[PDB]
Symmetry: C2
């Protein structure tokens, strides 16, 4: 089945804020929402379907006709109710070894977001954002994401 | 779908969702993947590229999916769609009473707009890239199709 409806409203909130910002500041990259395929490797095949994918201006060439080919700048994952610890670990490990520079884990069930940022070859310790916090990334310098706008009441 | 398809979907979602955020009490918009259940026996479940639910119809939105005909359904033509698939979605939305149905063609940068009158859709209104797309379901919202179809 598709994700639940609140999962999709959280996703569209996030996409709305990031896409609005990119549109008013042309030349800052593009954002895509699921379903958008990201090919991190062809053999053994690792194709993922993140909820949101951001590609910086200097990486636009990753955007192929059919899918995104390589590690995007920011991947966003929204936890569903049927996610097991091993699924969280094996996505975190895949994005780390592919060198995805920033990874957001959004948890609808606790209204929190964990941010991981790559430093060298490994992710730094997660920074945690609660619903009352404002989320920002150096990848999107001039963007403030109030998480009260992301997590519906 | 291909990346230009998703860019088009995102462009439409950006415009509609921004409008609804700035005009609270006007409904909610969902993007794929969002399940819409138009029939339970026999089961007929679609994943439209975009789904709009008016404020009065927000009870259609359950925990898992949307049960019933939303006010607006947006389908973006993909290259792999078969004739029976396009025919049967049109027929399914028409008999379910979906009030407005947009078919977005990325290959011609056009949108075809069907609105329900009685039991049947009227003749379609065709919008080109140089036009403003709008719907009485969203009074006050201009969707310039030059911001929807990338150059
Ligand atoms: Cl479908
Ligand atoms: Mg989507």
């Amino acid at each position: 089945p598709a994700p639940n409806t609140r999962h999709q409203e959280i996703s569209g909130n996030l996409f709305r804020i990031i896409s609005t910002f990119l549109h008013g500041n042309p030349g800052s990259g593009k954002v895509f929402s699921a379903p958008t395929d990201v090919i991190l490797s062809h053999d053994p095949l690792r194709a993922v379907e993140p909820d949101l994918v951001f590609v910086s201006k200097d990486r636009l060439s990753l955007i192929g006709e059919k899918n995104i080919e390589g590690a995007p700048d920011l991947l966003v994952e929204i936890l569903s109710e049927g996610t097991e610890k091993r699924d969280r670990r094996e996505k975190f490990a895949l994005y780390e070894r592919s060198g995805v520079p920033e990874y957001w884990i959004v948890d609808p069930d606790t209204n929190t977001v964990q941010v991981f940022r790559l430093s060298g070859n490994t992710y730094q310790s997660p920074a945690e954002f609660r619903r009352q916090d404002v989320l920002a990334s150096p990848l999107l310098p001039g963007l403030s994401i109030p998480l009260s706008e992301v997590f519906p009441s």
